[PDB]
Amino acid sequence: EIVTEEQGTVVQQQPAPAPTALATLATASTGKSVEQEWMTFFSYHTSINWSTVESQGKILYSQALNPSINPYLDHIAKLYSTWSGGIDVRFTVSGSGVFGGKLAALLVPPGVEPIESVSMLQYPHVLFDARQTEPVIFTIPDIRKTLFHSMDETDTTKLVIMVYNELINPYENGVENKTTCSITVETRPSADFTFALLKPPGSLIKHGSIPSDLIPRNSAHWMGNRWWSTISGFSVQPRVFQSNRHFDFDSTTTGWSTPYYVPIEIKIQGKVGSNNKWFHVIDTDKALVPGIPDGWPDTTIPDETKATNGNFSYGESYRAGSTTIKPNENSTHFKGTYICGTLSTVEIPENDEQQIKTEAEKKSQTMYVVTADFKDTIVKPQHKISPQKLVVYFDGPEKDLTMSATLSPLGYTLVDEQPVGSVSSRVVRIATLPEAFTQGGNYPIFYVNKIKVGYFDRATTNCYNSQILMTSQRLAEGNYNLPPDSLAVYRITDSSSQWFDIGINHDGFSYVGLSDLPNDLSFPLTSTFMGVQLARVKLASKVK
């Protein structure tokens, strides 16, 4: 027969006390009264800085009503598939009695995008003076067209904290920056706020989850998708581009490698009737795209060069110091390649053995991998990866044989001052090269790494990355969505007191509301999710 949800015969057993009496003793000691206690107090949400530089009208905070606003809701929310109701707020400013300045908070209804203008104040708002101690408390109501919110919805009442009267300080002794205080925002679910239908474990969100964890909270977990190094800088450009571990908002990748740094396994061709140092790669074992090994470098060589043997060689122009660099003083042939520590072995043939065994017993050597055309005597650069454009350079065998090696990248063979991946035409476009141009007032940006250089000493050079490894992972494995003309905005803050908003777009690139970005900023960064904003609105910031 048919069995419902609680259906079932209940049996009684000997060791069995009085459930109720025990329950009472607990609540007696506990003090239990309401079942959802997190609805009776304010929880720390976030904090935003307020500088003397920002002028009347700037929005220092624009976050939309979502259970995510409250740590507890955000947690329970994972069990449901629908929510509705409002959320209370308690915000306070922590400034010096010496400071001066008003702040205004207002609730904007859905279907409306805020604007950093003073006119927004000709609307009901809450006043908060920098000198106030008593926190102010109000509620972000839940205005909605639907009967209830699905988990993907983002168009909800939005709380906006704008600057009413510019913050002042009677002390102009500051150099890099005058002063600044904190604004903390606490949340408490409102009485009407309630979770709806339960969501069966492990289900997805029919329209795509809100992209709130694309960037890691701590810059210490930031690694680039070009190099496994740890992000250490940003670079604003009028056009960003990359194709390899760059993933689209829909887990799509025009590249040929996964969002993980794994060892590369290839097979090289040993040439008999010839004495060359550059070898071809027959095939690879582990690969996303049939033919191209997963993880094969993203750049090519600068110019055409003969297959002549050689080692490193740089002129006095490169020598220690900081003087101008000369691109013609680089006599390194395998310049622009990737240094890859290796573990190789050779296959000993049957009876038609000539003297391969000798070579097989040889110690492995570091291979200098790269991608480019390779005819008889010349090695031309190629920015169109293919199972036939994989070249390797090293003191390999001179006898016909097939060698297998498992190598892992560790460095780049310096070419010049320019950071790796800076030239479009030098980036291995597998077919289409994803790109992002300046838009409105926001500019695209690369994430800067640090690749170890080969000839110099404990030296390194800068490397551009289109996305942060974790972003690529999340976007590649998860199920995210992003309305038509909008982007996932995040607030990056350094250990100093500077911050700027980064807005990942659908394509996967990050933007900023600045022409340039400083480098003199304490790097133990931290980022928090702000929300989804229209891409036609210049991203906020506070640097220089």
User: What part of residues 18-77 is at the interface with a copy of itself (CB under 8 A)?
Assistant: 18-20, 22-23, 25-32, 35-38, 40-45, 47, 71-72, 75-76
Amino acid in position 371: T
Q: How many residues bind a copy of itself (CB under 8 A)?
A: 194
Q: Which residues in the 388-447 window bind a copy of itself by CB under 8 A?
A: 394-395, 404, 406-408, 410-411, 431-432
Q: Please identify which residue in 55, 192, 220, 520 interacts with a copy of itself, judged by CB under 8 A.
A: 192
Q: In this structure, which amino acid lies at residue 275?
A: N
Query: Dihedrals φ, ψ of 28, to 5°?
Result: -65, -45
Shortest distance (Å) from residue 525 CB to a copy of itself: 16
Please tell me the distance from the alpha carbon of residue 487 to that of residue 507, in angstroms, as a whole number. 10
Residue among 60, 67, 77, 101 that touches a copy of itself (CB under 8 A): 101
Only one of the segments 118-126, 294-302, 500-508, 509-517 lies at the binding site for a copy of itself (rule: CB under 8 A); that segment is 118-126
Beta strands in 99-192 (DSSP E): 102-108, 126-129, 136-140, 149-150, 158-163, 180-189
Residue numbers 460-479 binding a copy of itself by CB under 8 A? 479
Between the alpha carbon of residue 477 and those of residues 331, 482, 527, the distances in Å are 44, 16, 21
Residue 294 lies near a copy of itself (rule: CB under 8 A):
no
- Name all contacts of 533-536 with Cβ < 8 Å and 24+ positions apart: 533/62, 533/113, 533/486, 533/487, 533/489, 533/503, 534/113, 534/485, 534/486, 535/439, 535/440, 535/442, 535/485, 535/486, 535/487, 535/503, 535/505, 535/511, 536/440, 536/485
**Binding track over 483-522 against a copy of itself, x by CB under 8 A:** xxx-------------------------------------
- Nearest to 543, CA basis, from 494, 476, 475: 494
Pick the piece of the chain touching a copy of itself (CB under 8 A) from 107-115, 375-383, 464-472, 514-522: 107-115
Name which of residues 362 to 381 contact a copy of itself (CB under 8 A): 362-366, 368
Among 56, 58, 207, 386, the residue binding a copy of itself under the rule CB under 8 A is 207
CA gap 339, 419 in Å, rounded: 16
Sole binder of a copy of itself in the list 67, 85, 293, 419 (CB under 8 A)? 85
Interatomic CA distance for residues 137 and 135, integer angstroms? 7
Cβ(369)–Cβ(296) under 8 Å?
A: yes
Give the binding range for a copy of itself (CB under 8 A) out of 219-227, 333-341, 377-385, 466-474.
333-341
Among 56, 58, 59, 106, binds a copy of itself (CB under 8 A): 106
Distance CA 153, CA 226 (A): 34
Residues 126-185 that bind a copy of itself (CB under 8 A): 126-129, 131-139, 141-152, 155, 157, 164-166, 168-174, 177, 179-184
